[PDB]
């Protein structure tokens, strides 16, 4: 029941922050600390990113809120996608290394 | 109550080790040596194999 | 700003036990890999049990619960579809994709007590045969008579719910500490104090070399991060005698499987599932 | 006041205001800033060692993100001074 | 850009413990200016022993010729704080994130310090 994403609800929603420029909040539905922690740690590697963090306010409500603040050089969505792509490439490299080590 | 399986704390299968544990206890083996012979390095599995009480025998007899 | 380049070195590899070292990566990646391999890797296990004869002293629900915990070979877990996702059938008996049928029938016609193990559990698909380790997992013990006949169905599931679809068994990782010795304050210490310092360590992390009459670092991976030697050195009056700090970019992984899948295959499946999760989380650009 | 901090809250506040020897880096400070309503203060600790980068935040500044900027507090017994919503000083006592 | 610069020698340590795992308030007396200083320094991270000599500097900004709010390479114990009390032999009370500093000297030595201003703390042990 909890595994299935709610019907009619998108996994990731984009909401811009009016008070702070170049600030946005990403609400990831049906996510846990696994994705949030690695995304937060990957975002810190980017130089343009200023604020990177995630929170899980309600354990019962399986949602993850990710807040990204960047300089006047890249959009928060661009940094988010870049971090996801870098993490995917790292996973590919780790899989290749493990496959080589097994053989 | 038969020996519990899957070692509630750890998750390791211990269902098929009760007969071996009893056989080791039949010989001149202490509880620690018997548990070590079964390759149980975590004390949760050792507790599960040591704190179990065989109650199914009384259920079958009575 | 870009991706990392982790390095993997395998120390020991077996069917159910794997120990490898992961380097040049953050703690978050290792923790996420551990969590995925302990709670996200799917396996096949019995969830629905139908019985007709239950003359055994044990209750029906107890038998069903202890049947659901039996480890089964899960080589097809990745390819199989979920029961809720399977739309070809509503779910009854054997299915070509989701459900696997199991039949058990035990009748005791002898004075000796009959033990219903996991070996006498037959399935239509040979690939879903329960893992054999021995005498097998004892299900029910039967006296004279007391027949037990049941029909069971096994479905693919995630280890997050009911904690019975988890193939991993306490997968761990450490930071692989590095030991630093001043080697100058040791000369001031007497022979008696060196022995006491050696005995202070809970595990065999430091050794005494008889030829050089000085302490050496042996097996640095078994430190367990217990501040016993540091406290002993501070008590003896030497504050900076031994400095031990964890290494943030080095890790040593220990993966123990339950027999459902191979440990290397478990790691590969965890990596694939993490990649799929990242792909699903990925958000398309909007203009 | 009818409502107090509570056991865990009081103990955590005492620990974060008494130790003063544990510093929080940028990642942990930003992670904790999610629950705090107010913005992050300056690190106030640029360099602690000749070869230590990554300027850190002190524990007392973490507790300072719980007061409005216009709020001003003074507790002479515990030597607590809050100016512009920032906890300037504290010695001991935990009576405040 | 440096307002106050002087050489200090530590007189005593209030905790005076090597492994107390606590902030240690240092007492240093200035040379050629006769100024007394209280400063909370983490001894475990930055070791200071009685009798050591260190230079101390205070600048409103770390940038060169303006840009208030690159001297980082020269020093090794940079701190940031504000001056909240100038009441006196005038003395200054600057808190670096809860770490109190008490610089007591002469009225003429310290006169260009304003109230409620942000100032840095540069310290190098020679
Ligand atoms: Zn265990
Ligand atoms: Zn089906």
Domain positions in chain C are 1-42+164-287, 43-163
**Half-sphere exposure for C142 (CA within 13 Å, toward CB):** 23
Q: Which residue has the tokens 């068994």?
A: C169
As a whole number of angstroms, the distance between CA C37 and CA C60 comes to 32
Q: Residue D55 contacts by C-beta under 8 Å, 6 or more apart in sequence?
A: D26, D43, D45, D46, D47, E78
- Look at the block and give the residue holding tokens 């299935």: A4
Domain layout of chain E by residue ranges: 4-126
Q: How far apart are CA B19 and CA B21, in angstroms?
A: 5
Could you tell me the two tokens for C277?
């999760």
- Sorted by where each begins, the domain ranges of chain B are 1-62
Number of CB atoms found within 10 A of residue C248's CB: 11
C-contacting residues in B 2-61 (Cβ below 8 Å): 2-3, 5-6, 10-13, 15-16, 18-20, 42, 56, 59-60
Per the listing, tokens 């904790």 go with: D32
Q: How far is CA C5 from CA A97, C21, C173, in A?
A: 10, 14, 18
Which 8-state DSSP code applies to residue C113?
P
E99-104 vs E118-124, strand pairing mode: unpaired
Chain D residues near residue A33 by CB distance under 8 angstroms: none
Name the 3-class secondary structure at B55: coil
Q: Which residues of C79-90 are buried (b: 16+ CB within 10 A; e: fewer)?
A: ebeebeebeeee
Are the C-beta atoms of C93 and C154 separated by less than 8 Å?
no
Using an 8 Å Cβ cutoff, are C98 and C80 in contact? yes
**DSSP conformational letter for C55:** -
Task: Measure the CA–CA gap between C150 and C54, rounded to whole angstroms.
Answer: 8
The CA distance from C78 to A32, in Å, is 21
Measured between alpha carbons, how far is C116 from D6 in angstroms, rounded to an integer?
55
Comparing CA positions, the residue from E113, E107, E110, E104 lying closest to residue E36 is: E104
Q: Would you give the distance in Å from CA C189 to the centre of its chain?
A: 44
Which residue(s) pair with C244 in the sheet?
C179
Are E117 and E80 in contact, with CB atoms under 8 Å apart? no
Nearest C-alpha neighbor of C99 from the set C43, C45, C49, C155: C155
- Torsion angle, alpha carbons of C68, C74, C79, C81, to 10: 0
**Do residues C169 and B11 touch, judged by C-beta distance below 8 A?**
yes
Q: Which two tokens stand for residue C92?
A: 């009854």
Q: How many CA atoms lie within 13 A of D38 on its CB side?
A: 16
At what resolution in Å was this solved?
3.1
- Cα-Cα end-to-end distance for chain E: 20
Distance from residue B9's CA to the centre of ligand 1 (Å) = 5
Which residues in chain A touch residue C277, judged by CB atoms under 8 angstroms apart?
A: 34-35
Q: What is the DSSP letter of C97?
A: S
Q: Which two tokens stand for residue D55?
A: 């300027």
**What are the phi and psi torsion angles at D56 (to 5°)?**
-105, 170
Nearest to A35, CA basis, from C275, B57, E49, C103: C275
Instruction: Return d(Cα A36, Cα A55) in angstroms, integer.
Output: 8
How far is Cα C70 from Cα C256, in angstroms, rounded to an integer? 17
Q: Show which subunits contact B, needing at least 3 CB pairs below 8 angstroms.
A: C
Judged by a CB distance cut-off of 8 A, whether residue D26 touches chain A is yes
Q: Is C237 on the interface with E (CB under 8 A)?
A: no
> Which residues have C-beta within 8 Å of that of residue E124, sequence separation ≥ 6?
E54, E55, E74, E75, E76, E77
Chain A residues with CB under 8 Å of D33 CB are 51, 53
- Nearest C-alpha neighbor of E25 from the set E100, E103, E123, E124: E100
Q: Which two tokens stand for residue C216?
A: 């050496």
Q: Which residue of A has its CA nearest to D39?
A: A20
d(CA A38, CA C160): 20
Angle in degrees, CA E22, E25, E30, rounded to 5: 155
E24 near E14, Cβ under 8 Å? yes
CB D47 within 8 A of CB D64: no
Token output for A13: 């929603």
- Residue B7 annotated as binding site: yes
- Pick from D48, D49, D89: CB nearest E100: D89
Name the structure determination technique. Answer: cryo-EM
Chain E interface includes D85 (CB < 8 A): no
Residues in chain E with CB shorter than 8 Å from the CB of C239 are 18-19
Could you tell me if D31 lies within 8 Å of chain A, comparing CB atoms?
yes
User: Which residues lie across from D48 on neighbouring strands?
Assistant: none
CA–CA dist C263, A98 (Å, integer) = 12
Nearest to D44 among E21, E23, E79 (CB): E79
Beta-ladder partners of E38: E27, E102
Q: What is the spatial distance between Cα D23 and Cα D57, in angstroms, rounded to a whole number?
A: 6
DSSP A14-50: EEE-SSSTTEEEEEEET--HHHHHHHHHHHHH-SSEE
Tell me how long chain C is.
Answer: 287
Q: Which residues pair with E26 in a beta bridge?
A: E13, E39
State the Cα–Cα distance between residues E45 and A41, nearest whole angstrom: 26
The two tokens of residue E83 are: 């001056």
Q: How buried is D48 (Cβ within 10 angstroms: 0-12 exposed, 13-18 middle, 19+ buried)?
A: buried
Please count the CA atoms within 13 angstroms of the CA of C208 that sit on its side-chain side.
14
Q: How far apart are CA E74 and CA E71, in angstroms?
A: 6
Give CA torsion, residues E2, E8, E13, E16, to 10 deg. Answer: 100
Task: Enter the tokens of residue C113.
Answer: 């007590």
Please tell me the distance from the alpha carbon of residue C162 to that of residue D24, in angstroms, as a whole number. 38
Whether the Cβ atoms of residue A63 and residue A103 lie closer than 8 Å to each other: no
| Residue in this structure with the two tokens 């329960």, named with its chain if needed | C130
- Token representation of residue D56: 């850190």
The whole-angstrom separation of Cα E123 and Cα E57 is: 6
Instruction: Give the separation between CA D68 and CA C229, rounded to whole angstroms.
Output: 46
Which residues in chain C belong to E strands, given as ranges?
7-13, 17-23, 43-54, 100-108, 114-116, 122-123, 140-142, 145-157, 172-174, 178-181, 206-209, 214-217, 242-245, 250-256
Report the distance separating Cα E73 and Cα E115, nearest Å. Answer: 28
Distance CA B19, CA B4 (A): 13
The owner of tokens 């983490």 is E42
User: According to DSSP H, which parts of chain C are helical?
Assistant: 27-39, 60-68, 185-188, 191-200, 229-236, 263-281
Chains near C (3 or more Cβ pairs under 8 Å)? A, B, E
* Cβ pair A98, C8 in contact under 8 A: yes
Q: What are phi and psi of D64, to 5 degrees?
A: -75, -15
The C-alpha R_g of chain A, in whole angstroms, comes to 16
Distance, C-alpha C39 to centroid of its chain:
10
> Which pair of tokens denotes residue A75?
């959009």
Burial class of residue B48 in the structure, from the number of CB atoms within 10 Å of its CB (0-12 exposed, 13-18 middle, 19+ buried): buried
Burial class of residue C184, CB neighbours in 10 A (0-12, 13-18, 19+): exposed
Helix A33-45 crosses helix A76-102 at what angle (to 10 degrees)?
110
Helix, strand, coil percentages, rounded to 5, for chain A = 40, 25, 35
> Are the CB atoms for A25 and A66 separated by under 8 Å?
yes
Residue C186 tokens, joined: 């040791």
Contact A52 D35 (CB under 8 A): no
CATH topology of domain A12-103: Gyrase A; domain 2 (3.30.1360)
Distance in angstroms (rounded) separating the CA atoms of residues C267 and C257:
10
d(CA C207, CA C217): 6
Pair of tokens at residue E32 = 């050629």
Q: Which residues pair with C48 in a beta bridge?
A: C153
**DSSP SS3 for C30:** helix
Distance, in Å, from the CA atom of E101 to the CA atom of E56, rounded to the nearest integer, reads 12
């Amino acid at each position: 029941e909890r595994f299935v994403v709610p019907e009619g609800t998108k996994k990731v929603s984009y909401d811009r922050d009016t008070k702070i420029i170049n600030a946005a909040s990403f609400t990831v539905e049906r996510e846990d600390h696994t994705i949030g922690n690695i995304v937060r740690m990957q975002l810190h590697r980017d130089e343009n990113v200023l604020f990177a963090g995630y929170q899980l306010p309600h354990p019962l409500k399986y949602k993850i809120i990710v807040r990204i603040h960047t300089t006047s050089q890249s959009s928060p969505m661009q940094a988010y996608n870049q971090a996801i792509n870098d993490l995917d490439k790292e996973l590919d490299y780790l899989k290749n290394q493990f496959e080589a080590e097994v053989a | 109550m038969i020996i519990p399986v899957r070692c509630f704390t750890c998750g390791k299968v211990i269902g098929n080790k009760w007969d071996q544990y009893l056989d080791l206890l039949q010989l001149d083996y202490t509880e620690g040596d018997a548990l070590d012979a079964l390759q149980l390095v975590r004390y949760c599995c050792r507790r599960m194999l040591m704190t179990h009480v065989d109650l199914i025998e009384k259920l079958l007899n009575y | 700003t870009y991706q990392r380049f982790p390095k993997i070195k395998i120390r020991e590899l077996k069917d159910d036990y794997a120990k490898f070292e992961l380097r040049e990566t953050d703690v978050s990646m290792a923790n996420a890999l551990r969590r995925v391999m302990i709670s996200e890797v799917p396996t096949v296990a019995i969830d629905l049990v139908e019985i007709e004869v239950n003359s055994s002293v044990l209750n029906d629900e107890f038998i069903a619960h202890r049947l659901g915990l039996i480890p089964l070979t899960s080589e097809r877990a990745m390819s199989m579809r979920f029961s809720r996702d399977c739309d070809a059938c509503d779910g009854d008996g054997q299915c070509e994709f989701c459900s696997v049928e199991f039949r058990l029938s035990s009748k005791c016609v002898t004075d000796q007590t009959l033990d219903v193990t996991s070996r006498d559990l037959y399935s239509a698909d040979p690939t879903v045969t329960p893992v054999d380790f021995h005498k097998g997992i004892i299900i029910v013990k039967l006296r004279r008579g007391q027949e037990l006949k049941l029909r069971a169905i096994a479905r693919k599931g995630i280890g997050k719910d009911h904690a019975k679809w988890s193939p991993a068994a306490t997968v761990t990782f450490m930071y692989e500490p590095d030991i630093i010795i001043n080697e100058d304050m040791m000369d001031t210490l007497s022979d008696e104090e060196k022995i006491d310092l050696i005995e202070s360590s809970p595990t065999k992390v430091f050794g005494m070399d008889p030829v050089t009459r000085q302490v050496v670092v042996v097996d640095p991976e078994a430190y367990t991060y217990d501040e016993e030697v540091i406290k002993k050195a501070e008590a003896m009056g030497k504050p900076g005698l031994i400095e031990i700090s964890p290494k943030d970019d080095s890790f040593i992984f220990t993966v123990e499987s339950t027999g459902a899948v191979k440990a290397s295959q478990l790691v590969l499946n965890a990596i694939d599932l993490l990649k799929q999760k990242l792909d699903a989380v990925r958000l398309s650009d909007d203009t | 006041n009818l409502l107090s901090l509570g056991q865990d809250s009081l103990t955590a506040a005492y620990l974060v205001n008494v130790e003063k020897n544990c510093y929080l880096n940028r990642a942990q400070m930003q992670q904790l800033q999610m629950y705090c309503p107010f913005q992050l203060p300056p690190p106030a600790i640029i360099k602690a060692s000749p070869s230590s980068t990554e300027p850190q935040w002190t524990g007392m500044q973490l507790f300072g993100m719980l007061f409005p900027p216009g709020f001003d507090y003074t507790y002479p017994l515990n030597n607590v001074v809050v100016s512009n919503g920032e906890l300037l000083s504290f010695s001991e006592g935990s009576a405040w | 850009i440096i307002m106050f610069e002087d050489i200090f020698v530590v007189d005593k340590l209030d905790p005076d413990g090597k492994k107390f795992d606590k902030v240690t308030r240092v007492e240093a007396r200035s040379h050629n200016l006769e100024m007394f200083m209280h400063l909370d320094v983490n001894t475990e991270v930055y070791p200071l022993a009685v009798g050591d000599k260190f230079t101390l500097a205070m600048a409103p900004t770390l940038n060169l010729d303006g840009t208030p709010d690159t001297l980082a390479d020269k020093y090794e114990y940079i701190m940031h704080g504000k001056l909240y009390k100038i009441s006196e032999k005038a003395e200054l009370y600057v808190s670096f994130g809860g770490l109190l500093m008490l610089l007591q000297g002469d009225p003429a030595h310290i006169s260009h310090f304003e109230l409620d201003q942000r100032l840095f703390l540069l310290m190098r042990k020679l």
